[PDB]
Amino acid sequence: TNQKPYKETYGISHITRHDMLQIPEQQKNEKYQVPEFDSSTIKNISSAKGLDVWASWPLQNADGTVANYHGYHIVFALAGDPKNADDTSIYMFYQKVGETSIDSWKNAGRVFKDSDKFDANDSILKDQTQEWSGSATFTSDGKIRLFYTDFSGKHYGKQTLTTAQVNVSASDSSLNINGVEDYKSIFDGDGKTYQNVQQFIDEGNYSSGDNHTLRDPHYVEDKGHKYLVFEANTGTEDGYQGEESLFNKAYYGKSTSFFRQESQKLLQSDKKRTAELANGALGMIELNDDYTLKKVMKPLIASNTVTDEIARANVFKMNGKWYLFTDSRGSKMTIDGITSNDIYMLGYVSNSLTGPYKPLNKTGLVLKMDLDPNDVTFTYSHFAVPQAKGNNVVITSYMTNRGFYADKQSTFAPSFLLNIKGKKTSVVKDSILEQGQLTV
Ligand SMILES: OC[C@H]1O[C@@](CO)(OC[C@H]2O[C@@](CO)(OC[C@H]3O[C@@](CO)(OC[C@H]4O[C@@](CO)(OC[C@H]5O[C@@](CO)(OC[C@H]6O[C@](O)(CO)[C@@H](O)[C@@H]6O)[C@@H](O)[C@@H]5O)[C@@H](O)[C@@H]4O)[C@@H](O)[C@@H]3O)[C@@H](O)[C@@H]2O)[C@@H](O)[C@@H]1O
Ligand SMILES: OC[C@H]1O[C@@](CO)(OC[C@H]2O[C@@](CO)(OC[C@H]3O[C@@](CO)(OC[C@H]4O[C@@](CO)(OC[C@H]5O[C@@](CO)(OC[C@H]6O[C@](O)(CO)[C@@H](O)[C@@H]6O)[C@@H](O)[C@@H]5O)[C@@H](O)[C@@H]4O)[C@@H](O)[C@@H]3O)[C@@H](O)[C@@H]2O)[C@@H](O)[C@@H]1O
Ligand SMILES: [Br-]
Ligand SMILES: [Br-]
Ligand SMILES: [Br-]
Ligand SMILES: [Br-]
Ligand SMILES: [Br-]
Ligand SMILES: [Br-]
Ligand SMILES: [Ca+2]
C-alpha cells in the first residue's frame, strides 16, 4: 500500500499511546491514587436539599488562587433533579472564609433565571438546554465574571463557550444574586483548529460514534493577557480525526519500533474506529478586555487515537512553572490495560503558558480513581486548586454518581492535597480535608 507513516506534531504537545500504555502499571503506586474516603463521614450539601451537586469550580483570582469575595468563598456547581439527567443548571454556593464544614456552604440559588438566556439577544443562547461546567474569575474592578458551557440538546449537543457577569449583593449574613449582565456567546469552534458542531451533525452525529466537545472553559491570565483554556476536539488543520491519523507517529511516541508494533495492532483491532475518531484537545483562545473572542490559538495538547474526551481543562502558574491538567475516563480510551473503571487526572508542565508541555511523572498520570461506579465514595471531575503558599494544591471533586442513591446525592467530596515538585507530583498522605474545602 502507498499509505505510509509520517510524523507531524502540528506544533503542539501530544498525549501519546506510548505514555498511556505505561499507566496501568504505574497506577499501582499509592503516590498517584485518590485516597480512600470514609463513607461514614459523608453528607449531602444541606443547603442544596434534594439536588445532585456535581462538577464544581471556585471563584478564582486571576492567578488561580481562591477568591475572597467580601469575606466569602464562592463555588459554582452544576446541580439538578436526580431523576432527570437533562436538568443541569449552575448554582452558586458560598461560605464565610475560615469556615470549612460541609454545612457551612450556603446556597444563593441558580445564577440564571429562565429568561436570562432569551433576554441576552444572542442567537446561540436562545437554544441552550443545559448549563455545563466552566470557571469564574474575580476581576480587577471587583466583578464576578463567569465562563461556562452553553449546551444545546436542540442542536445535536452543540457546546458554546459562554460568559456572563454575575451581580451579587452582600448582607453580613448572606449573599444575593441580583442578576447577570454582559451575557454572550464567545466561541463555538472554527472547524480548522477546533471541531464545530456542524461537522458532528453532518458526519452522522450520534450514530457515528464521534464525541463532539467544546466545553469546560478555564480562565487564565499571563502578563495582562486574558485566555480561556477548554476541552475541545481538533479541527481539519491541526491533526483531524480519521483513518489517516493512525499513521502519525507523533501520536504513538518516540520510537519507530514502538510505532510499527502499536499501529499494526491498532489497525487490525476492534477499537480501530474509536481510535480514528479520538481527537480530544485542550484548546486555547485569547479574549479581548470585554471578554469577546480576540484570537483562536492552537491547542496546548491533543489526544489523537487515545480519547475523544479530555475534560475539565485547568492551567495555572505555580512556583515558576505552568501546570496543565485534564480529567479523562478509562471507559472512553483505547489503551490496553486501562479499564472501564479507571478514571484519571492527567497533568503536564511547561515553562510557558503556551507550551510546549511535557508529561508529569513521565507518563502524565497524576491521579487514578478506580472505584466501582456504585461505590458511594466514587469521585469524578477532580480539579487542582492553587494555593497562595507552598508546594501543595487542593484537589476538589464531587462524590457519588448522579442519580444512583435515593438519599445520598452527588455532593462535595472530601478535598485532599497534591504535592507538586518540578515535573513530579505526589498525593499527600493523610491529607483529607473537609468536604468541599478549597484552601488550607
Ligand atoms: O426546572 C428544570 C426543568 O425545567 C426544564 C425545562 O423543562 O429545564 C428548563 C431549565 O433548563 C434551562 C437551562 O439553561 O433552560 C433550558 C432551556 O431550554 C428549553 C428549551 O428551549 O428547555 C429544554 C428542556 O426542556 C425539555 C423538556 O422539558 O425540552 C423541551 C424541548 O424538547 C422538545 C423536543 O421534544 O419537546 C417536547 C416535549 O415536551 C412536551 O410538550 C411536554 O410538555 C411534550 O408534548 C413533548 O413530548 C422541544 O419541542 C422542546 O423545545 C428538555 O429535553 C430539555 O432539557 C427552555 O424551555 C429552557 O429555558 C433553565 O434556564 C431552565 O430553568 C427541564 O429540563 C427541567 O426538568
Ligand atoms: O455534566 C457536564 C460536565 O460533566 C463533565 C465532566 O465533569 O463531562 C461530560 C460528562 O457528560 C458525559 C455523560 O453524562 O458525557 C458526555 C458525552 O456524551 C454525549 C453523548 O455521547 O452527551 C450526552 C448528552 O447529550 C444528550 C442528549 O442531548 O444525550 C445524547 C444521547 O442520547 C441519545 C439516546 O440516548 O440520543 C438522544 C438524541 O438522539 C436524538 O433522538 C436524535 O435526534 C436526539 O433528539 C436526541 O437529543 C444517544 O444516541 C446519545 O448518546 C443528553 O441527554 C445527554 O446528557 C456527548 O455529546 C457528550 O460529549 C460524561 O460521560 C461525561 O464525563 C464536564 O466536561 C462537563 O461540563
Ligand atoms: Br426563572
Ligand atoms: Br437537553
Ligand atoms: Br470536515
Ligand atoms: Br482520514
Ligand atoms: Br476516515
Ligand atoms: Br440511599
Ligand atoms: Ca472526534
Residue numbers in the entry: 32 to 471
Sentences from the paper on this structure:
Recently, it was demonstrated that the LS from Bacillus subtilis (SacB) is capable of synthesizing polymer distributions with different molecular weights through two distinct elongation mechanisms. All of these structures display a single domain with a five-bladed β-propeller architecture, in which each β sheet adopts the classical “W” topology of four antiparallel β strands. In SacB, residues D86 and E342 have been identified as the nucleophile and the general acid/base, respectively, whereas D247 is the transition state stabilizer.
In this work, we present the crystal structure of an inactive double-site mutant of SacB (D86A/E342A) in complex with levan-type hexasaccharides, which are intermediate products in the synthesis of LMW levans from sucrose. The crystal asymmetric unit contains two molecules of SacB, chains A and B, each including residues 32 to 471. Each chain contains a hepta-coordinated Ca2+ ion, water molecules, and bromide ions in different sites, which are from the crystallization condition and two oligosaccharide molecules. Although the enzyme was cocrystallized with an octasaccharide, only the electronic densities of six fructose units bound by β2-6 glycosidic bonds were observable at the active site of both SacB molecules (oligosaccharide binding site 1, OB1 site). The levanhexaose molecule is oriented with its nonreducing end at the interior of the active site pocket and its reducing end protruding out of the central pocket. In this way, it can be established that the side chains of D117 and F182 participate in the +3 subsite, the former through a hydrogen bond with fructosyl 4 and the latter through a hydrophobic interaction. In the next subsite, the +4 subsite, residue Y237 forms CH/π stacking interactions with the fifth fructose unit of the ligand. Of interest, Y411, R360, and K363 show a different conformation in chain B, with the position of Y411 being similar to that of the apo SacB structure, while R360 and K363 shift their positions by 6.0 and 4.5 Å, respectively, away from their positions in chain A.
